[PDB]
Design a protein around this ligand. Structure first.
Ligand code: CL
Lengths: 121, 177
């Protein structure tokens, strides 16, 4: 139970009838296992790789619960590493895929401007 | 109700224009009658009377539907699509595609909204017309372009546009037979 999930469920695109392939189901499954392990931080480079080639985490047309769940944990993680970065900078060029995905999800779910990660562009 | 006539024998098939029409008709049924011809002397695309600037003519006619993106900003990308992304020359196309890829670094859509704009339609359609872009997109050389292109392809309005064209050419043959 979270505010972010509640707001996602209030959107129309929430109710679309996506049918996962085995590969998609495997992908949603592995991200929930990472969430359950509490190890999203070690898996951020994997996340960035997924997002390099996929707009949303489970290769969908619209964001799914996987996106929201991973986003809720990843957001504070990412804005910490931006704030603790030695090279503004390199962090941005490297993790740009998580950053564009963060920017989509935070705006979709109407995250407060105070809690929002400011994207440079 | 306007009429958009698409030519199946155009060296550059008017996918952007077709998709624009499909967007309009999905949101506003019976707005545009889509017709196919299959003749090398026919224009690639024709909206009622007009053979020039058809894409912009559709987007400007249906202003409520095509409401997003600063119009000057939209035009930058519509112009890149129409004059650069349709070019079947790897050396030119590579430069053009890097401009698009760079724009997409931190964006899901070309102009950075939560939803696609006419800019996305024009560029996607231009790339779909360009047989050369197939291997480029498939091989993910421009990772952002491939990520973006494969997103819109999943939307039937875009991804089944070719199916519509092929079926309509089938029906054109059938009516002749
Ligand atoms: Cl309209």
């Amino acid at each position: 139970m979270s505010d972010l999930v509640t707001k996602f469920e209030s959107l129309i695109i929430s109710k679309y009838p996506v049918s996962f392939t085995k590969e998609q189901s495997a992908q949603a499954a592995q991200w929930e296992s990472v969430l359950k392990s509490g190890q999203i931080q070690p898996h951020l480079d994997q996340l960035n790789l997924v997002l390099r080639d996929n707009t949303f985490i489970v290769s969908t047309l619209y964001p799914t619960s996987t996106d929201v769940h991973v986003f809720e944990v990843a957001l504070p993680l990412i804005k910490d590493l931006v704030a603790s970065s030695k090279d503004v900078k390199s962090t941005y060029t490297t993790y740009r895929h998580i950053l564009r995905w963060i920017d989509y999800m935070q705006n979709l779910l109407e995250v407060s401007s105070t809690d929002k990660l400011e994207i440079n562009h | 109700p306007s009429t958009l006539t698409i030519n199946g024998k155009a060296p550059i098939v008017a996918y952007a224009e077709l998709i624009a029409a499909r967007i309009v008709n999905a949101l506003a049924p019976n707005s545009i009658a889509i017709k196919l011809v299959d003749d090398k002397k026919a224009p690639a695309a024709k909206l009622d009377d007009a053979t020039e600037d058809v894409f912009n003519k559709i987007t400007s006619k249906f202003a409520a539907i095509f409401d997003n993106g600063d119009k000057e900003q939209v035009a930058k990308w519509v112009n890149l699509a129409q004059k650069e992304l349709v070019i079947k020359n790897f050396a030119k196309l590579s430069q053009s595609l890097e401009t698009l890829d760079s724009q997409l670094n931190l964006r899901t859509f070309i102009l950075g909204g939560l939803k696609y704009s006419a800019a996305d339609v024009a560029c996607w359609g231009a790339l779909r017309s360009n047989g050369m872009c197939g291997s480029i997109i498939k091989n993910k050389v421009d990772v952002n372009v491939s990520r973006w292109y494969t997103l819109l392809e999943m939307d039937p309005i875009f991804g089944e546009a070719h199916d519509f064209l092929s079926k309509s050419l089938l029906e054109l043959k059938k009516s002749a037979n």
